[PDB]
Design a protein around this ligand. Structure first.
Ligand SMILES: Nc1ncnc2c1ncn2[C@@H]1O[C@H](COP(=O)(O)OP(=O)(O)O)[C@@H](O)[C@H]1O
Ligand SMILES: Nc1ncnc2c1ncn2[C@@H]1O[C@H](COP(=O)(O)OP(=O)(O)O)[C@@H](O)[C@H]1O
Ligand SMILES: Nc1ncnc2c1ncn2[C@@H]1O[C@H](COP(=O)(O)OP(=O)(O)O)[C@@H](O)[C@H]1O
Ligand SMILES: [Mg+2]
Ligand SMILES: [Mg+2]
Ligand SMILES: [Mg+2]
Lengths: 151, 370, 370, 370
């Protein structure tokens, strides 16, 4: 029951890095180099969730939970890889001279939406892992026995 | 611990805890599976979607209801819905909670025995009980006497109850409900040029049915009004941005409840099925049944359904009787609300079917107790 | 070892390694052979030039493309380009690297089968995989949902993808791209007295196309504007030293993407091909396709192509949806960038076609996996 | 005077006189308009071609069908076809002949009100009547009982009729027919390297479909036979002089009737649509519908369609019923032949909609009679 509540704190570190990234999109062109660095560690913090949500799947004995958890958690190795590579492409395109005010305006939305898609994919594997903790808890004892009330 | 009240309808699952005033989880009773090609690696690996996620991703799925007309037809897809409403929706373990299930009357007996075996041998509940849906609608009305009309997604049934005594020879059942009105509205929407053929486009016509349809007080006056005027027209916007306009199919769709010949059935309408259920009862209890006509279920939620039921039963009743139709605003959850009352009674805890009672009698114990 | 990504387009070869942000080697996909008399001893004895060697000595060569319309037509010339991009451009050995290749949809099956036989029995790669170019353009945009317009040098195709599922009945393909615009610009430059006939002078008109051509927002306004003034005129200096002056052919050359009847084709424009491919999809996913119109490939690099695409699809859309065209500045390499994302995925390493699997099934194994 | 029978199909017009055994005029239901430049004075000034002269000059024309899916979409072009089949094909005046027209079931009601107005106010016929196409296919079979399967160029519909009574709740309709198989064959011909994109090239693939295609009795055996052997190959000579060779696409094109997933549809095949239409009928008439399975229309003319329909319905039927499919050799004209039977009846002569009845009630009289 110790690696079951590890997932919530791991997925809450990503909620702080997303809210940090949502503040940097209000500023001008000076804060966009810190936006790319704020996107290259969301993709690393998401790698911690898929590292230990696999460990919960090795613990759960219910096959309808352990296979529904691995089917939803495999999106996180995909959207994280295309977030740390798309951030590398946008880190090179700022090296040009006089791009626009609008060209770099839409270039951040390709990193925000790619990170909102990663955050929406990692909250849907916490749900199927919180449902795994109900099966792990009862198979290791911890079960409230029901007794019928006497008239 | 707390008893669970699960109301497995043909169209919606209403689940929650015993004692509350509203169900906690209300989601569609569908299972969707993908029908297209998963070309992107990693994303397309989920095999089936169950609850509201089959309704939001419905553009790429094939939607299936496991319950047709009250009878569970797909037993593997039904366990997916029951596993979804325990772990993912209520987030409780089923080993620590007794579960109250419901059923319609005049169902097969293998339907009630297999859902007893699934509850005891797959989810391992401590106790269970199956109830009748029209009995529970009387608990949710402040009454012990009255004839219930319960119309949901697959079944329409009448049950007369007098002082806690049901008259099972006068119980009616008609397999015509909200799923058959959705299919009829799809057929008469082709007269304007709109074609909804997909199972995902069936969930769109069900949303047009729930917003634009009503019950006409006089059917032949409204059919002549809609031909002379254009004030009966309304507009609905599709998910892609197109706008459709229906004017005549708003009241012609729920007239199938009062004229079931519109879909090729020979049965009588729900106003005549109710009156025939009263006249099968004893003459001394008929006066207290005319004054208590409890409407329940989701298909009884059209505008004008209760003023049309009062007009048609008064024309059959002997004209010195007092007809009164009880239609509360919480009609859609009457089977759940009265099911939480029954599971909360202190008398009821001797009436559960415990798991050690199940071991000597098998699944046949549900017929001798429920 | 590191996987190789090779994007054999009709006009350019984009090669590199899996994981980087840009292709390492970008060179024209031509093979030139001499057409004159080698009178000096020792020097004129090379028989074929491949990369920028043929683009530099093009005045004495006959340039030919081994790929037209996305289909490899010369197989002895395509082995020269693959041998040049391995040993001379990337400077690697093909036996130590799995190679990712791309292909357009609705292509002949003999084209994909022969490129696995060349890769396995001439260059001896350990593994390979053939991907669809418009699926890889969706990886390079951070999306899993949207309709891609890939337009390169031979093929213009549309692919709708929703949540990682492609809808292959809604996939379009039009054989009109940047080589058919170069040939049309060569034809309408005869109205001013400029004659470009050889294959070396075709590479000069491709530079005029890449520098002076744009897409008008309304074609009938600027066709009267350019006749009223001389403000749309521009000048270009030829390699000889002469100066040409084009004023009307700047927006008339890329107009044939939107009016393909300028070159004698019955097909619809790229705005109607995008709208007809959205309307072949299911009605619930159409809203998320209108809002994600990914543009890809080098022919979509005209000034004004994305504002003309937004005007024309909005005139066909149902006026409640919002249209949005995603056109990043790295459009020319989005098939490569998404190809390096796919070959870097840990899920992808069970999807290679290994050489052990090829020896049991022959070249027909590429249809079952890719 | 003699009545006229006009069967406006989606692809072909079948016109003639009531009483005969075959239609007099059978021509394609197209309208062609030129797309090129008329450089010679006097010759190229005809602006529209209609019948067989649009099929012969199709190399310089853009061909348009005014009817898709059974619904008339172009009303200016549909009057050109009706004016062609009266004055130029039948060579009669429309004022001296009552005209029998046909329509598919579940069609829009504005389609039948407008074609009543065109007949009464543009061609000035004395009387008219619109009949259901699958009812007329039962007249032309010598029966009064049986379920019809009519499959033409846009619509595939099922109609059960028992002793002259139709069961309209069991009438099916599927928008998949011979034009949706021409488009699918064009898509799977790209796998062999053949590209037909023009609307005039669509008429060439329709001749390949009508000559080389057949229905496999077991689809998975023929897909393995064609990969091991080469005896399923056949050759076709194009109008240019080239020769194409298809071996696998001969049975994969008509399999879309039995697996509509091949073009991205969720519907069931024509064998499951027929069985579901029988089971919607009453149990006492189901035995007389299994033994009378009338096939009609041009899409039912593949070699092996009737031996495949017998195998698939027998696998769904309860195994003590006998299945018999009635497929006469004159299947392509059975809607016309039964239309000449009905218009020749002395009982029918009081069922015309006369022109004086049209002036009193307007175009809504066509629904109160037909
Ligand atoms: N406002 C409404 N008007 C008409 N029909 C409605 C309305 N709301 C729900 N329905 C119909 O009610 C049915 C489901 O009601 P419910 O009694 O919950 O079903 P079940 O008992 O089968 O779970 C559906 O067919 C739905 O279309
Ligand atoms: N700035 C530009 N404007 C217009 N056309 C361009 C531009 N840059 C490249 N092109 C055209 O793009 C084509 C090659 O684009 P690309 O997609 O890289 O090729 P491929 O056909 O190999 O996919 C050539 O026909 C070239 O003329
Ligand atoms: N021998 C054949 N085999 C297969 N398809 C055929 C054959 N003959 C005609 N067809 C198809 O039949 C269709 C027209 O059939 P028909 O019922 O006469 O047309 P409609 O009912 O639309 O007027 C065309 O799509 C044509 O391709
Ligand atoms: Mg219910
Ligand atoms: Mg390309
Ligand atoms: Mg026909």
């Amino acid at each position: 029951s110790s690696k079951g509540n590890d997932i919530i704190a791991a997925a809450k570190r990503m909620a702080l890095l997303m809210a940090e990234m949502s503040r940097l999109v209000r500023g001008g062109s000076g804060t966009k180099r810190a936006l790319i660095q704020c996107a290259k560690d969301i993709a690393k913090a998401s790698d911690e969730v898929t590292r230990l949500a696999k460990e919960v799947a090795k613990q759960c004995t219910d096959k309808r939970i352990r296979t529904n958890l691995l089917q939803v958690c495999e999106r996180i190795p995909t959207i994280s890889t295309q977030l740390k590579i798309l951030s590398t492409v946008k880190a090179t395109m700022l090296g040009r001279t006089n791009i626009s005010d609008e060209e770099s305006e839409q270039a951040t939305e390709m990193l925000v939406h790619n990170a909102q898609n990663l955050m929406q994919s990692v909250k849907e594997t916490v749900r199927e892992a919180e449902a795994a903790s109900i099966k792990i808890r009862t198979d290791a004892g911890f079960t409230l026995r029901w007794v019928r009330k006497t008239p | 611990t707390t008893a669970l009240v699960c109301d497995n309808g043909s169209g919606l699952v209403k689940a929650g805890f015993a004692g509350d005033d509203a169900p906690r989880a209300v989601f569609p009773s569908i299972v969707g599976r993908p029908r297209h090609q998963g070309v992107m690696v990693g994303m397309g690996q989920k095999d089936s979607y169950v609850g509201d996620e089959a309704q939001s991703k419905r553009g790429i799925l094939t939607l299936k209801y496991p319950i047709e007309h009250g009878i569970i037809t797909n037993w593997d897809d039904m366990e997916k819905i029951w596993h979804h409403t325990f772990y993912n929706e209520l987030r409780v373990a089923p080993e620590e909670h007794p579960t109250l299930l419901t059923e319609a009357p005049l169902n097969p007996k293998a339907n009630r025995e297999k859902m007893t075996q699934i509850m005891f041998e797959t989810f391992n509940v401590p106790a269970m009980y199956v109830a009748i849906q029209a009995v529970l609608s009387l608990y949710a009305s402040g009454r012990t006497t009255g004839i219930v009309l319960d119309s949901g997604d697959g079944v329409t049934h009448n049950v007369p109850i007098y002082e806690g005594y049901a008259l099972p020879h006068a119980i009616m059942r008609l397999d015509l409900a909200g799923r058959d009105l959705t299919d009829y509205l799809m057929k008469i929407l082709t007269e304007r040029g709109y074609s909804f053929v997909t199972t995902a486009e069936r969930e769109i016509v069900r949303d047009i049915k729930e917003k634009l349809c009503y019950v006409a007080l006089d059917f032949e006056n409204e059919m002549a009004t809609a031909a002379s005027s254009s004030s009966l027209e309304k507009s609905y916007e599709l998910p892609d941005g197109q706008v459709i306009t229906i004017g005549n199919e708003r009241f012609r769709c729920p007239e199938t409840l009062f004229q079931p010949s519109f879909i090729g059935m020979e049965s009588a309408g729900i106003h005549e099925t109710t009156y025939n259920s009263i006249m099968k009862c004893d003459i001394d209890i008929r006066k207290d049944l005319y004054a208590n006509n409890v409407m329940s279920g989701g298909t009884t939620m059209y505008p004008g359904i209760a003023d049309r039921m009062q007009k048609e039963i008064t024309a059959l009743a002997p004209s010195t009787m007092k007809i009164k139709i009880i239609a509360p605003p919480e009609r859609k959850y009457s089977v759940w609300i009265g099911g939480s009352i029954l599971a909360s009674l202190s008398t009821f805890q001797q009436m559960w079917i415990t798991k050690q009672e199940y071991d000597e009698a098998g699944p046949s114990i549900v017929h001798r107790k429920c």
